[PDB]
Amino acid sequence: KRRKTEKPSLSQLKSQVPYPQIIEWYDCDARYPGLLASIKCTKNVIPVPSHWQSKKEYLSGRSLLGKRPFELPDIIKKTNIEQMRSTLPALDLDYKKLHDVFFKIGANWKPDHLLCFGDVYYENRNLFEETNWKRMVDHKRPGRISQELRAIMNLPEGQLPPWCMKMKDIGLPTGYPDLKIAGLNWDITNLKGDVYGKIIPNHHRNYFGALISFETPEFE
Amino acid sequence: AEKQRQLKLQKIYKQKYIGLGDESTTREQWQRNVRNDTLNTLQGHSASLEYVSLSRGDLSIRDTRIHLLKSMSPGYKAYLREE
Amino acid sequence: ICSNKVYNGRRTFERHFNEERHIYHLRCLGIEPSSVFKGITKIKEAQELWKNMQELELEEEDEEGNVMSKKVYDELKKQG
Amino acid sequence: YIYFITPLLEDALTDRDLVHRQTASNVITHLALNCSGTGHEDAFIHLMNLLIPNIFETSPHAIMRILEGLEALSQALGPGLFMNYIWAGLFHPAKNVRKAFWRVYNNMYVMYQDAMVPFYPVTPDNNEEYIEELDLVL
Amino acid sequence: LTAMGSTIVLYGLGKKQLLRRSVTQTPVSITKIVSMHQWNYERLAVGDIHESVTLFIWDPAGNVFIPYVDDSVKRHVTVLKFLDEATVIGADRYGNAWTLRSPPECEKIMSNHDPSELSNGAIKYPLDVITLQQKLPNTYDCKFKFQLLNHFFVNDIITDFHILDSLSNSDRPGCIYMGLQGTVGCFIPLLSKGNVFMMGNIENIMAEADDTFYLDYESRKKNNICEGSCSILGRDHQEYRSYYAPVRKVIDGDLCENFLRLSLNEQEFLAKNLKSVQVEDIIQTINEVRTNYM
Amino acid sequence: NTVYVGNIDPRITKEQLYELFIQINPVLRIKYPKDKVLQAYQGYAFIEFYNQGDAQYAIKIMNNTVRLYDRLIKVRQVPIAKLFIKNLADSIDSDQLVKIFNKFGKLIREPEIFYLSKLKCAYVYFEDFEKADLAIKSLNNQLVANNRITVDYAFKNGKGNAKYGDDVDRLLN
Amino acid sequence: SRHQFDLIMCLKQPGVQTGLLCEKCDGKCPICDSYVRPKRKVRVCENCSFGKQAKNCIICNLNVGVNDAFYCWECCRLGKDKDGCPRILNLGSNRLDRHFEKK
Ligand SMILES: [Zn+2]
Ligand SMILES: [Zn+2]
Numbered sequence A: 001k002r003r004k005t006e007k008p009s010l011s012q013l014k015s016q017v018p019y020p021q022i023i024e025w026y027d028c029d030a031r032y033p034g035l036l037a038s039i040k041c042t043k044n045v046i047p048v049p050s051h052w053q054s055k056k057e058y059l060s061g062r063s064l065l066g067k068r069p070f071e072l073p074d075i076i077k078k079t080n081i082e083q084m085r086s087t088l089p090a091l092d093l094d095y096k097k098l099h100d101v102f103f104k105i106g107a108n109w110k111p112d113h114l115l116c117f118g119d120v121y122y123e124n125r126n127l128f129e130e131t132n133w134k135r136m137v138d139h140k141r142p143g144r145i146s147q148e149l150r151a152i153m154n155l156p157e158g159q160l161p162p163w164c165m166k167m168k169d170i171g172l173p174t175g176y177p178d179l180k181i182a183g184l185n186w187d188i189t190n191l192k193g194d195v196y197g198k199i200i201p202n203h204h205r206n207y208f209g210a211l212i213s214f215e216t217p218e219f220e
Numbered sequence B: 001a002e003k004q005r006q007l008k009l010q011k012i013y014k015q016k017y018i019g020l021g022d023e024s025t026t027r028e029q030w031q032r033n034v035r036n037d038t039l040n041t042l043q044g045h046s047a048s049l050e051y052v053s054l055s056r057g058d059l060s061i062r063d064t065r066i067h068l069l070k071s072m073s074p075g076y077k078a079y080l081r082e083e
Numbered sequence C: 001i002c003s004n005k006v007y008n009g010r011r012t013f014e015r016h017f018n019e020e021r022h023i024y025h026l027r028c029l030g031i032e033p034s035s036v037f038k039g040i041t042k043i044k045e046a047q048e049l050w051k052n053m054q055e056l057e058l059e060e061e062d063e064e065g066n067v068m069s070k071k072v073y074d075e076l077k078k079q080g
Numbered sequence D: 001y002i003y004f005i006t007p008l009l010e011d012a013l014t015d016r017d018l019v020h021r022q023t024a025s026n027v028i029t030h031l032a033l034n035c036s037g038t039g040h041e042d043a044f045i046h047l048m049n050l051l052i053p054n055i056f057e058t059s060p061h062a063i064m065r066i067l068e069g070l071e072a073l074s075q076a077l078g079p080g081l082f083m084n085y086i087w088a089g090l091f092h093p094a095k096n097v098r099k100a101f102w103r104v105y106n107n108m109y110v111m112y113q114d115a116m117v118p119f120y121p122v123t124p125d126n127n128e129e130y131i132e133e134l135d136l137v138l
Numbered sequence E: 001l002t003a004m005g006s007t008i009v010l011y012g013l014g015k016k017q018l019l020r021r022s023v024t025q026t027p028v029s030i031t032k033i034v035s036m037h038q039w040n041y042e043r044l045a046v047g048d049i050h051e052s053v054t055l056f057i058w059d060p061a062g063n064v065f066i067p068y069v070d071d072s073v074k075r076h077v078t079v080l081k082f083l084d085e086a087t088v089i090g091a092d093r094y095g096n097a098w099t100l101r102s103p104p105e106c107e108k109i110m111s112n113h114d115p116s117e118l119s120n121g122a123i124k125y126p127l128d129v130i131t132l133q134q135k136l137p138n139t140y141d142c143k144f145k146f147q148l149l150n151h152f153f154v155n156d157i158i159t160d161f162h163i164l165d166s167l168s169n170s171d172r173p174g175c176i177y178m179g180l181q182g183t184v185g186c187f188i189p190l191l192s193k194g195n196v197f198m199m200g201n202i203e204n205i206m207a208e209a210d211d212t213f214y215l216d217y218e219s220r221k222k223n224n225i226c227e228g229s230c231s232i233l234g235r236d237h238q239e240y241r242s243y244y245a246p247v248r249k250v251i252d253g254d255l256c257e258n259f260l261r262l263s264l265n266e267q268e269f270l271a272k273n274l275k276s277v278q279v280e281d282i283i284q285t286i287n288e289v290r291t292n293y294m
Numbered sequence F: 001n002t003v004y005v006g007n008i009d010p011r012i013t014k015e016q017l018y019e020l021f022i023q024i025n026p027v028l029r030i031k032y033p034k035d036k037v038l039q040a041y042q043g044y045a046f047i048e049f050y051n052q053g054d055a056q057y058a059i060k061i062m063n064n065t066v067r068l069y070d071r072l073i074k075v076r077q078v079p080i081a082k083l084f085i086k087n088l089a090d091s092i093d094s095d096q097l098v099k100i101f102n103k104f105g106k107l108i109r110e111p112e113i114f115y116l117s118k119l120k121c122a123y124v125y126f127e128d129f130e131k132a133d134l135a136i137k138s139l140n141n142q143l144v145a146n147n148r149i150t151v152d153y154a155f156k157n158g159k160g161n162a163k164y165g166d167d168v169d170r171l172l173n
Numbered sequence G: 001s002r003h004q005f006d007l008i009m010c011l012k013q014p015g016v017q018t019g020l021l022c023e024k025c026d027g028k029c030p031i032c033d034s035y036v037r038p039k040r041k042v043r044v045c046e047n048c049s050f051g052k053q054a055k056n057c058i059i060c061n062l063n064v065g066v067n068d069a070f071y072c073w074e075c076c077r078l079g080k081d082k083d084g085c086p087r088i089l090n091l092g093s094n095r096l097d098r099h100f101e102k103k
């Protein structure tokens, strides 16, 4: 009773904290709030996954209904057993082939997503969309437009995007000062296919561990 | 039954290994375990013991070791205060 | 902080933290927006919280300017 | 073979069935014990990041499989990160979250003590007495 | 370039006394700076008592060092050096010898951008990094993290690291350290792979070799020496050398050296576990390190 | 920072939006809703850039520019004193109210005329708690158009509390 | 035990003696009941040996064991090897309801 009503306000607790935004309303009933704020707000600690205080047993997810059953890592998919055995609604293969897939072909191979120091998987999360996202931030760059989005845009080949004219009056993108586009800052004769422009960088090892040779263990 | 066994193993592991936070443990009880284990390792490794000896600048190293031993008990602060 | 307003649910009040009017009360109050102030209730405490939110030596020629500030020695550049 | 496993455990640990999460954790036990110290911790970091949310999962089989899995992860990651999770959840008000994480911290205190010594997030403002000898520099 | 308890002051040369040219306020995490080191005046690695290394970059005309990477875990760093631009050596008060590396996601950004745009200005970070900033501001405040590269445990407390481009004209540049309790040891980067493959297999042999002797001695008792016979002590190698944190890519040669002293019967008994080269070539590869690598 | 985009064909997908706007500026985040009931895109998205400079830039260059599935793409960028007054005369026009309260204080909005019980009442919005105090002091229990009107604070219980002067002062600031 | 829950252990400081297991239980690591790569022989406190009870299988507690029990390499690294004296003091609900079930 008295101890329950003795609690300091969470904002009174914020001042003790160097990173006050992590502390939350429920920290008021922390039996040792001044300590718990220091631990929770300590540098490298990773806050408890928030699926607690929910009674849903951490997975009720509607998204769980729409998750793909599985996908082979493409290196293993090269092994062709996908066609040999149909998992969807004998199969002998070469020892050298399989062994080389894991070792010769797949030594340097690593899953593309993984996760980071403090990455924690909440129920509603799905990594796959973020994998295509990270891969997409990689492939796609300004000045280039795929033929699909080009067809939807109804832009014929050899013709500049509609924002090149408004970009002539307004100016180059503030975010891309080094961006070049045919007809304006960049040679129109170099206009080719899906690329109407490219960023021209103005910036222009061994890491003590350079192996200088790569030799995998041989099965034979 | 299973959880009930985990209670008994909680009593046994707590007996052997001393401080193990069960569910509710006061910060005074637990921080004492922290201090005791940290000092325990500082004096336990001849390495870190040699290190604290020099950085502290004591005349002998066993002064630092038995210092840590004494520093394990809470009343040693007031003991230093009474010197 | 909001008109001593009443809320019928804790999820809803937890949604009040990101809102137009709630941020208008904060920012117009002088307590700037977003995520540090989320747990606010009363107007008073976040004022001291916002108060919680908000020596170089350029060597003059007499060799006493080792205490002298950068901008000060630039002012003595404009004076010199 | 560890890396080719992690995309499979991706759908395993994420799966809704406490059975699949259970046996997947049993995979992480042996895999983590025998692969510990190989340098795959970055993959082990992933595999754990999917496990932490399962700590609160009840039932005896699930709870012991997940405990053993996390203890195997303590050997492959080392306490420090595994600690970091345990710390940021170590006390907490919830009376439930607390009872759950102090199990993992009990097993961690059983296997490792000196190993956890450097990793206690304890500062002079954090606790009164602290230890005067940790700040000594020569 | 000096470090206060909290902050890093860069003093110039004044007359009648020395002047503060610039001051850099530390992130809140750093209480004190035990040791620090530079890379070609452009970069810094700053250590702590409690927390771990954090790398800074000097920005001219910004007159400030900007932290661009945090460290993963809490490590008490006594002495610290650079192998490279992107990697760092460090020891512990408790005897861990580790080496960290900035992630390629950070190396691309700093290679492709000027430091002046880090503190203020436009630097485009992938979606995940920002979500880690609002999600976990305490850990990811420095917006990158050191992936553990090498980790090791030497029971001494390392006083001085030195990176020598060559040890007695040897090609592979080594890093040699002197410990406080006294010791000097080296970490030699292994070129190619099958070097570390053969070394790794030999270390794996000598690791449980005591157990192999115990299982042979057990089988002969089934048809008709304790467990710690070959190690003389119960500690496993991976266990002892792991200790605080598991050794990552570092293979320990101090073990494989013990293979040299064992009798020919014992050695030939151990090497049979390999389809690879004979004991003689084993000893060849073992003794190769002191000869060729230094 | 964040820009609203609309008049979008549900066949436009997330990768297509990303590839579209990366041509304009760097895109920090894209929230592109998905209807759970219909299992379809509801045809408007939100693109959060790295700053309001690139945001406003994309608003200027992007608006009424790109044509996707023959439909044009749209882009759009994403607390006061209140006095209750009772027993007003039927001859009192809202504009007459405006004239009456302008001398005391500037009105942030127009008065609201409503009938209680027959009983003509109005809400008057002042930009200042102090000017509201002026219209109260002078106009309380006064006879206008041969009818006695009462001027006080409207309920929220009623306005004019101690924290109300404090925060309304700030909203004035 | 790892599987049957009600089985209680000893957990005292192990002595020099080595625990025996019957041919029926042969091959199990007394903690995890694993058949793979055993390492170190079990050691029990003297309080679990003494007379006839020394001959019992430390696992099933009933039969008289010839063979020595070894810890696996997973328990030897998990340290449960050195935890204490493994033994099963109570026969357990499984074995009980088995005996009462048959007779
Ligand atoms: Zn509010
Ligand atoms: Zn016993």
Ligand SMILES: [Zn+2]
Binding pocket: G021, G022, G024, G025, G026, G057, G058, G059, G060, G061, G062, G063, G065
């Ligand atoms: Zn038996």
Ligand SMILES: [Zn+2]
Binding pocket: G029, G030, G031, G032, G033, G034, G071, G072, G073, G074, G075, G076
């Ligand atoms: Zn076992």
